[PDB]
């Protein structure tokens, strides 16, 4: 409706995307603490997190509550099709489901679009690992 006024130093697109990412990241953290409150003292995830032996509070949160927003190059899922992310969506859909908010937990299991967008975000992490495993001794070798 053009009722949104831009923040100084940000474009209206940056203003919009900032506001949407705040809402959805707050929801991820609000649901995640609600999950951590649910866990009994017997809970074996909590036993391993609180010991610090393995896992963290976000792993609990993603298993139990919400996997959350999927990102590529730090942004929400790109319109790789013309004005849409997949043929299943209509054009100009900026909503959370369209742009890769996985509102399900790993226990509930992902919907098909969420599964693909979670594969897109997971590919970036696989590429970055391949890059940094190419540099393991690079600066050490040059400095020595």
């Amino acid at each position: 409706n053009n009722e949104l006024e831009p923040t100084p130093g940000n474009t209206l697109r940056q203003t919009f995307e900032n506001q949407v990412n705040r809402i959805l990241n707050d929801a991820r953290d609000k649901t995640g603490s609600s999950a951590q409150k649910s866990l009994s003292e017997y809970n074996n995830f909590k036993s391993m997190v609180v010991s610090g032996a393995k896992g963290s509070k976000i792993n609990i949160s993603q298993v139990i509550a919400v996997v959350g927003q999927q990102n590529v190059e730090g942004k929400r899922i790109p319109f790789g099709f013309k004005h849409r992310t997949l043929p299943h969506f209509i054009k100009d859909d900026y909503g959370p489901e369209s742009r890769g908010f996985v509102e399900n937990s790993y226990l509930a299991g992902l919907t098909p679009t969420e599964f693909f967008f979670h594969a897109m975000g997971g590919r970036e992490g696989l590429i970055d690992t391949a890059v940094k495993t190419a540099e393991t001794g690079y600066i050490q070798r040059r400095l020595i």
Partner: protein
């Protein structure tokens, strides 16, 4: 301003170029490959829109009402024909630079009316 187009020579259809009639003190458009000269009606030689302000409704094509993949709504009726369903979309463009305005097109065949809200 708008934009300034082209004139072509009647004799040879090459582009006419502006030059002054220095003795009558009037702008002429004149061919560079033949004697043809034409008196200008416009005085303006050139305009350039750094802000790119133009009515994008001139660039929306009415045939786009046929696209299965755009969202459509009865929530915004057409003025010219009253038809309830309109298709709506963003600029689908660069050079909007910021805005997220929705453009509407009437879905009634052969109406093709376009507006912005």
């Amino acid at each position: 301003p708008g934009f300034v187009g082209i004139r072509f020579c009647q004799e040879c259809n090459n582009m006419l170029y502006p030059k002054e009639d220095k003795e009558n003190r009037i702008l002429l458009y004149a061919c560079r490959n033949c004697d043809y000269q034409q008196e200008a009606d416009n005085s303006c030689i050139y305009v350039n829109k750094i802000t790119h302000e133009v009515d994008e409704l001139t660039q929306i094509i009415a045939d786009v009402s046929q696209d299965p993949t755009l969202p459509r709504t009865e929530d915004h009726p057409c003025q010219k024909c009253g038809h309830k369903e309109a298709v709506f979309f963003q600029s689908h463009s660069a050079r909007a630079e910021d805005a997220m305005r929705l453009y509407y097109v009437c879905t009634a065949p052969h109406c093709g009316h376009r507006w912005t809200e």
